[PDB]
Amino acid sequence: HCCSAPGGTECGECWGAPILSPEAAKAVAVTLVESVCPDAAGAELAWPPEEHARATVERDLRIGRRFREQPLLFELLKL
């Protein structure tokens, strides 16, 4: 209800589905990243190579622990 832009104009014929606002979902993703892992050493959008994953294993393990302790995060990803 918060992210869906208004909304209520009877789109389509009878199956109008409101789209999600990109700004609201972007803010949700940003605050989720800030709450899960506030680190910024490798926060670049470009995916590093595979061997690079052998240096930040502690951050990945803490992210996995945060995901396993609270499943709601997964639901937030679905948003």
Partner 1 sequence: ILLFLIDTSASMNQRSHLGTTYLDTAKGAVETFMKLRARDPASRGDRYMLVTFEEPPYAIKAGWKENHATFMNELKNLQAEGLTTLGQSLRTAFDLLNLNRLVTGIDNYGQGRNPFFLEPAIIITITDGSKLTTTSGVQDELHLPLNSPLPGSELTKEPFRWDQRLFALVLRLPGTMSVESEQLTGVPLDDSAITPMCEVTGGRSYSVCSPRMLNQCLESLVQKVQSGVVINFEKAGPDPSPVEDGQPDGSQPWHSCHKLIYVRVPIGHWPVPESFWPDQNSPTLPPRTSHPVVKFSCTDCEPMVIDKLPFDKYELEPSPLTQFILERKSPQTCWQVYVSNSAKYSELGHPFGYLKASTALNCVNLFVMPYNYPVLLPWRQSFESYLKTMPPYYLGPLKKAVRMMGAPNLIADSMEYGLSYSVISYLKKLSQQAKIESDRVIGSVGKKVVQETGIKVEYTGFQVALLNKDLKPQTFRNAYDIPRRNLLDHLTRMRSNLLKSTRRFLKGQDEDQVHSVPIAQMGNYQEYLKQVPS
Our finding on whether 18 is near partner 1 (CB under 8 A) is no
**Nearest approach, Cβ of residue 41 and partner 1 (Å):** 5
Between 33 and 55, whose beta carbon lies closer to partner 1?
Answer: 55
**Nearest approach, Cβ of residue 32 and partner 1 (Å):** 23
User: Which residue in this structure is represented by tokens 């918060």?
Assistant: 2
Rounding to the nearest 10 degrees, give the CA dihedral for residues 24, 29, 30, 33. 160
Our finding on whether 55 is near partner 1 (CB under 8 A) is yes
Task: Give the residue, chosen from 14, 17, 41, 45, that forms a contact with partner 1 under the rule CB under 8 A.
Answer: 41
- List the structure tokens of 25: 């979902």
Q: Reply yes or no: is the peptide bond before residue 16 cis, omega within 30 of 0.
A: no
